[PDB]
Enzyme design. Structure first.
Site: not given
Ligand code: HEM
Ligand code: X2E
Ligand code: HEM
Ligand code: X2E
Ligand code: H4B
Ligand code: H4B
Ligand code: ZN
Lengths: 403, 405
Positions: A107, A110, A279, A284
């Site tokens: 993330c 953070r 947000w 993305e």
């Molecule tokens: C507040 C604005 C936020 C922004 C701009 C943001 C940004 C991002 C981005 C760019 C990713 C990777 C996205 C992707 O390519 O899938 C990500 C992943 C992640 N974020 Fe955030 N995030 C935000 C808030 C949060 C919140 C509120 C949480 C949970 C409370 C969170 C928890 C996570 C987690 C657990 C991942 C990993 C998801 C996965 O492995 O699929 N983030 N975030």
């Molecule tokens: C198989 C698999 C594993 C893994 N760890 N994550 C995924 C999710 C895959 C990883 N990239 C694309 C797909 O998910 C989209 C999740 N992205 C959200 C929108 C991130 C996000 C952004 C802003 C705020 C948030 F709270 C969350 C898939």
């Protein structure tokens, strides 16, 4: 023991001491690094994760070693010893949810970790009630475009029985409809979940941006279908600051990025349904969602509109169109007054977070391949920053699709 | 499935298992407690002999003679040499083999589809700094081929016990000077401030420009390094212009044709070649994005965006992204105009995916460093971004080595 971590743009160096508190192995060994893989291949144990967590909680509120700490540790021991499990007090759950967000190596967002509205839905007993809670979250988090980070926590896993689960991977997603010709109308990432909705009785649209219904599942019950009321789903038409024709592509995206399929682990307890949202970072939408070849795959259409030479890679028509598409996303969200963050602003805020965490905790687990943006990597400062990746608890985990 | 790493391509949905990693005889920096994959630098007879044996086995496998009389005799010959001199020496074809194998094994190189086409110049007779110079000049001539670039490596003598190293002090055969200004700023390439200062100290009369070609500082065993200016006719350079933005030519940017790395150790069968410069041709993003746009290098993003008249006051105008694309196109265009071999990041990454399939068939895997393989602009626009990769150390190898001063 303690990895040296250098930033190559600035020549500065820190030492990560936080990684010593990792208790959960990742996928690398000294023989080979698997850091680029997306997925990983008793009462004594729950008790010790629970103690550790309670220790983290009382530490956070500055009452380590005090009375309330001592007795809360005994409440946990007494509860596990008798029932094989225990339950979190609400303020603990709020602390854990933020800590899980904080600890999430993939993330980039953070900096915002301490600002998280936590809805406690552990008193949910049905899919109907889950729906209501989900609609509340959506209404809250959206706030007419002034997005607000939120999480709603449904009831924990229990040894007896099946999980509370949200089948959708995000609360808001577009249908993907497989066509006779093996084409896909809509979002190819969601063909399966689209087909499941149909199978549980949803009448489908035929558009490229049909908001999918939710399939929600209470324990040991078939999942149920619930149509989101279209008034709750905030969407953003895409137009481009200078390119007049772009809007006629009819492209759009939804405001609220809301992950609904990850498990939230706190003190050894497991929350199988804990949807969270903040947000979007524009890349993305602009790069991955619209430009990936296995998604909407719009790069060629756009480049042709821009009248670029599509015949050869060396005209960089892909890179050119990719940028316009990201520009359109930013402009459109800014115009519709919806929170968005570009990858330059986000990565800059991430660097500051790194710095804050160094001072607070002695480091920050971070996954370089996910923190670095999917266009313009080295134009962002995270590119030049070495990162150490490891697992801290509380945590978000990926979990198996329930079907 | 198998007990080996499962490797997935997320665009195509295809899966492979890496069995090659089982061949890895050297630990990297990762443990199950933490991944240190993104760090740039991570850190006697018995040891030598076993590394030697393994190389000789590799060599005989690759000629299809494992187990043969010639194979066992060569082994016996290698042990006898180490028994009596503490070291040993490669046959000519063994050197050719191990050189190509080291390039094939380099996890950070996206150019590996070419690994089989390498001209190996044997310079193990070299015995002075002057002769190093001649060899380097011949390599540069051969490799440059008036713009029709050809991969090559020149191998100077191996490390000897108690005897000093052959070393090239420069990190590449062609680099631009960086002059520290009394402003604090740098004129030229800030990456090269130290080596520039060392050249002036060892008697170089310096220039005043942003693109002054550095002299070579070459070091024969146990001698101080000697200074050698490359005759300008030898160093091919490409002046930068843009296909449609007419003022770009007026910026006076330029780059050299020949990317030739010179500070890397080549390790084969426990033998260490401290001086074995090697060269290929550029991928355009190395120049357009890294050398020209890194904040700590030439840093030209803002200048170019001002010329393009972008809004540099806000991040969300994507002015950085737009200028970087034009600079990268400028690089491609100018190399194509001048007929100097270059490859764009799309072609390059497509061809590496093809190389991945090839090696899967050949060796059951391919060690690759995702963070380095994915290009520094337009990452997920290239197919490598969607491809999981396993990184591990195979030998023969190129290692980074500590600067000799
Ligand atoms: C507040 C604005 C936020 C922004 C701009 C943001 C940004 C991002 C981005 C760019 C990713 C990777 C996205 C992707 O390519 O899938 C990500 C992943 C992640 N974020 Fe955030 N995030 C935000 C808030 C949060 C919140 C509120 C949480 C949970 C409370 C969170 C928890 C996570 C987690 C657990 C991942 C990993 C998801 C996965 O492995 O699929 N983030 N975030
Ligand atoms: C198989 C698999 C594993 C893994 N760890 N994550 C995924 C999710 C895959 C990883 N990239 C694309 C797909 O998910 C989209 C999740 N992205 C959200 C929108 C991130 C996000 C952004 C802003 C705020 C948030 F709270 C969350 C898939
Ligand atoms: C044929 C054309 C070639 C291309 C397009 C190419 C491409 C590249 C690129 C883009 C990098 C990353 C560079 C960086 O970011 O610093 C790299 C790294 C590397 N390549 Fe190549 N390469 C080519 C030929 C060669 C040859 C001939 C060799 C040696 C025999 C070689 C060996 C290496 C090694 C050892 C690295 C790692 C360098 C380091 O750690 O600093 N490549 N290659
Ligand atoms: C401390 C340190 C460690 C390391 N492994 N590499 C470096 C060198 C750093 C790492 N990226 C930038 C700088 O190298 C420039 C090397 N690039 C050449 C030109 C690659 C290349 C390209 C085409 C053909 C070739 F033969 C070689 C520094
Ligand atoms: C194979 C590779 O690990 C995978 O494509 C990753 C790379 N980096 C990423 N980074 C982010 N933020 N999101 C992603 O989905 C991915 N995908
Ligand atoms: C910190 C990070 O590992 C470092 O900046 C790397 C990232 N990827 C790279 N990739 C290539 N090809 N060359 C580089 O110099 C780097 N730098
Ligand atoms: Zn690793």
């Amino acid at each position: 023991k303690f990895p040296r971590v250098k930033n190559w743009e600035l020549g500065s160096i820190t030492y990560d001491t936080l990684c010593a508190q990792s208790q959960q192995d990742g996928p690398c060994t000294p023989r080979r690094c698997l850091g680029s893989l997306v997925l990983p291949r008793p009462a004594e144990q729950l008790l010790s994760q629970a103690r550790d967590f309670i220790n983290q909680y009382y530490s956070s509120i500055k009452r380590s070693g005090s009375q309330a700490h001592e007795e809360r540790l005994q409440e946990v021991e007494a509860e596990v010893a008798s029932t094989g499990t225990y339950h979190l007090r609400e303020s603990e759950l709020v602390f854990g949810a933020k800590q899980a967000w904080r600890n999430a190596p993939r993330c980039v967002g953070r900096i915002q970790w301490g600002k998280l509205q936590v809805f406690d839905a552990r008193d949910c007993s049905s899919a109907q009630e889950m729906f209501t809670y989900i609609c509340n979250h959506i209404k809250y988090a959206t706030n007419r475009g002034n997005l607000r980070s939120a999480i709603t926590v449904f009831p924990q896993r229990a040894p007896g029985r099946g999980d509370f689960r949200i089948w959708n991977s995000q609360l808001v997603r577009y249908a993907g409809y497989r066509q006779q010709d093996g084409s896909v109308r809509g979002d190819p990432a969601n063909v399966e979940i689209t087909e499941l909705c149909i199978q549980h009785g949803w009448t489908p649209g035929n558009g490229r941006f049909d908001v999918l219904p939710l399939l929600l599942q209470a324990p040991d019950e078939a999942p149920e279908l619930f149509v989101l009321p279209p008034e709750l789903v905030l969407e953003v038409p895409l137009e481009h600051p200078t390119l007049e024709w772009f809007a006629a592509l009819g492209l759009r995206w939804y405001a609220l990025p809301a992950v609904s399929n990850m498990l939230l682990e706190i003190g050894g307890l497991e929350f199988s349904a804990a949807p969270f949202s903040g947000w979007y970072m524009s890349t993305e939408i602009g790069t991955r969602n619209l430009c990936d070849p296995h998604r909407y795959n719009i790069l060629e259409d756009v480049a042709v509109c821009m009248d670029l030479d599509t015949r050869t890679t060396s005209s960089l028509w892909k890179d050119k169109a990719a940028v316009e598409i990201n520009l359109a996303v930013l402009h459109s969200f800014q115009l519709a007054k919806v929170t968005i963050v570009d990858h330059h602003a986000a990565t800059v805020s991430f660097m500051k977070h790194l710095d804050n965490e160094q001072k607070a905790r002695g480091g920050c687990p971070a996954d370089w391949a996910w923190i670095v943006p999917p266009i313009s990597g080295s134009l962002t400062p995270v590119f030049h920053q070495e990162m150490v990746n490891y697992i801290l608890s509380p945590a978000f985990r990926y979990q198996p699709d329930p079907w």
